[PDB]
From a paper:
The closest contact is with GcoA-F169, which forms a hydrophobic interaction with the C6 carbon on the aromatic ring of guaiacol. A broader survey of variants at the GcoA-F169 position (amino acids S, H, V, I, and L in addition to A) confirmed that GcoA-F169A exhibits the best catalytic performance in terms of both specific activity and reaction coupling, although other small side chains (S and V) also permitted reactivity with syringol, suggesting that these may permit syringol to assume a reactive conformation at the heme. Each protein variant also crystallized successfully with guaiacol and the structures showed that the orientation of the bound ligand remained consistent with that of the WT enzyme. Furthermore, comparison of the surrounding active site architecture confirmed no significant deviation from the WT.
Residue numbers in the entry: 6 to 407
Amino acid sequence: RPDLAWLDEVTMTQLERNPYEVYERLRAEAPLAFVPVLGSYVASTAEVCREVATSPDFEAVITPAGGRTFGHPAIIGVNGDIHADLRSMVEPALQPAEVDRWIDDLVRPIARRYLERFENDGHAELVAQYCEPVSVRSLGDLLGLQEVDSDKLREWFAKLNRSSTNAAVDENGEFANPEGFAEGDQAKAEIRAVVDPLIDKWIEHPDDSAISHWLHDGMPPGQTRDREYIYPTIYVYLLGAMQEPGHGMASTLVGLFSRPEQLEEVVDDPTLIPRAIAEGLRWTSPIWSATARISTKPVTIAGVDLPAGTPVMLSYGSANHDTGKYEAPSQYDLHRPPLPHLAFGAGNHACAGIYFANHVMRIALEELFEAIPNLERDTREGVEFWGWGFRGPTSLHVTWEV
Ligand code: HEM
Ligand SMILES: COc1ccccc1O
């Protein structure tokens, strides 16, 4: 496409460091555009992302690096009967009435435990000391991975992140950094060594762990889902489900710190925490551009005639800065009107864990502000954000008097 020749010079490092300048141009120039270093069409605006995610002429496809990382059948990459079965598999513990039965007793003692380790120090790096541990320990316990330490869960989602977003391709469309998948393979081998004996046990002795229910629910007597059939969805969880609520709470805190009067409002009135998080997710979307759909017939989207078989990456992080919808979207603003956003995606493959994730983030921020009402950002330290596929702050140094 001749007028987009500047896209040939966009690098993967640029998109990882900060994709918003490139995507601001894409939203204006070409809401559906082929990005050479990604080797794919990308949808950058809210209208195009929603249309593709809900269109009957598209179905899910995994990103190239995502497929190399997760294999088949990852819940994000399949359709039809297999997708219906995997949704029925994961949905029970995520049902809102079910989450409401136990979410407080799950997350609140976890939040307290991590807080107790540092709440009197006067300094902390909240990503590693709080946001990521609460996110992974909550979900890990729900899944049946109580004995997998939070350090290890955090290391796994970071390796799976890097592997599944190792998207750069060369002049020939081949992966430019094939090495980059080796740490995803290593994380999967470690996961197998830990989880295979738990599956061995759950097959014979089912319990209330989510993974035991994935093996047993809906199955004929004495049968279980084959472990090779469920492992790719286990990996999907050990990446995003483990990583995202922590990144969402952290981005929300960075946003609030950028608006000190709003931080004070939310600390004074914790009923505003859900609104603060919704704006945080729009402002820096944790799943920024990690999923995709593929056309199943020829289709015209945003003026582009696509053949059947065309993948389109859904860059929901960019769609959530669409200036067709939002005023000054790069600014965090608690008092933005509560409008629809795309940080949980859309359509048949939209996020299955929204209600759970929102409560995990809410309870974590409730307990943080409670414990440390005079929390302030350490302004001697910069907050970098990193990531094109998944995006979040790499640290969040804070301070408080005591
Ligand atoms: C703030 C935290 C989270 C955010 C921002 C988020 C966002 C998303 C997004 C954008 C997608 C892809 C949707 C699409 O392609 O249209 C997704 C898919 C998914 N998410 Fe969430 N997620 C979060 C937490 C979680 C958690 C904690 C769980 C599980 C407990 C979860 C389970 C899933 C599942 C199973 C899918 C795949 C749905 C499918 O393909 O049918 N998510 N999520
Ligand atoms: C819930 O985890 C994911 C969602 C979308 C893409 C990759 C994931 O691991």
